[PDB]
Amino acid sequence: RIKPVFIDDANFRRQVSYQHAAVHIPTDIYEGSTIVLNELNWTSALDDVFKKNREEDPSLLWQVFGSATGLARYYPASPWVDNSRTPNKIDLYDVR
Amino acid sequence: QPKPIGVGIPTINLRKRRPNVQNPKSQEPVTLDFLDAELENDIKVEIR
Amino acid sequence: LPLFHIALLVLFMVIIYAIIGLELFKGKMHKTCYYIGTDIVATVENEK
Amino acid sequence: KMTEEECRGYYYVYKDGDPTQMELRPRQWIHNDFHFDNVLSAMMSLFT
Numbered sequence: 001r002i003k004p005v006f007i008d009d010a011n012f013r014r015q016v017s018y019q020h021a022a023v024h025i026p027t028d029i030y031e032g033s034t035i036v037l038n039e040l041n042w043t044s045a046l047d048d049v050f051k052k053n054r055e056e057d058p059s060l061l062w063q064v065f066g067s068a069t070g071l072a073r074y075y076p077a078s079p080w081v082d083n084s085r086t087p088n089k090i091d092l093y094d095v096r
Numbered sequence: 097q098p099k100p101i102g103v104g105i106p107t108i109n110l111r112k113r114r115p116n117v118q119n120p121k122s123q124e125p126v127t128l129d130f131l132d133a134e135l136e137n138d139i140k141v142e143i144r
Numbered sequence: 145l146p147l148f149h150i151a152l153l154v155l156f157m158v159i160i161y162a163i164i165g166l167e168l169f170k171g172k173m174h175k176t177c178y179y180i181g182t183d184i185v186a187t188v189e190n191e192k
Numbered sequence: 193k194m195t196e197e198e199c200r201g202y203y204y205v206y207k208d209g210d211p212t213q214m215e216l217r218p219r220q221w222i223h224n225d226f227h228f229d230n231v232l233s234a235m236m237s238l239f240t
């Protein structure tokens with residue numbers, strides 16, 4: 001895992017980290033799968049284009065890659081709105 | 097406006113709602129036609 | 145046919161126990177716990 | 193989920209078979225309490 005620093009921002013009214021991308025995996029998709037781990041391995045080369053896109057157009061909002069395995073890798077990183085077990089409201093978001 | 101588009105009349109059954117089961121919310125877009133955002137003549141239809 | 149007296153006994157014993165339980169238990173098992181303000185019956189994992 | 197490598201993570205259970213009232217449970221690979229893996233266990237299962 002990665003623990004980010006999460007400065008606060010305008011143009012996103014939330015705490016956002018321009019260092020890396022965040023990854024969303026649907027709640028009922030085990031990460032740890034061989035499909036999922038082979039995905040987080042090659043999608044790791046996206047963060048440099050995410051960073052370059054944002055460096056050339058500082059007025060950019062979310063940039064996302066939605067995978068056909070259920071993953072969503074977005075930039076900039078930012079904690080999700082709903083965690084499945086943190087509170088009591090299960091998040092039902094699937095990119096597909 | 098930033099609110100969802102409403103369809104029909106909203107009615108729920110309050111005697112069949114567990115307190116802690118996390119209702120689903122929404123996935124629809126805010127699709128508001130042009131003739132439902134203003135008052136509609138015959139000229140606005142042909143402009144549209 | 146030798147079982148004509150055991151049948152006549154099981155019958156009149158089931159009748160007596162039905163009449164006794166009809167007197168001590170009639171109408172006592174109609175309350176249960178629901179969630180407050182709902183018609184959902186509130187049980188546990190493998191409770192009935 | 194059919195094999196043990198798959199039966200990992202969380203999953204949804206629906207209360208009273210209602211798709212709009214779900215809750216999260218961890219999924220786990222469970223063994224039956226009475227099984228036939230060795231002869232002592234099979235003898236116990238057949239005793240019951």
Ligand SMILES: CCCCCCCCCCCCCCCCCC(=O)OC[C@H](COP(=O)(O)OCCN)OC(=O)CCCCCCCCCCCCCCCCC
Pocket residue numbers: 225226227232233235236239
């Ligand atoms: C051909 C061979 C000849 C040799 C024969 C010897 C005589 C045998 C006569 C006894 C009859 C035994 C039949 C009972 C079925 C066997 C039950 C058994 O084996 O269970 C083993 C049990 C394993 O269960 P498992 O699910 O694997 O547990 C996992 C977590 N521990 O793990 C256990 O701990 C179970 C403990 C078993 C306790 C058995 C006690 C029985 C005592 C009987 C006395 C009462 C009978 C009196 C007379 C009856 C009528 C005449």
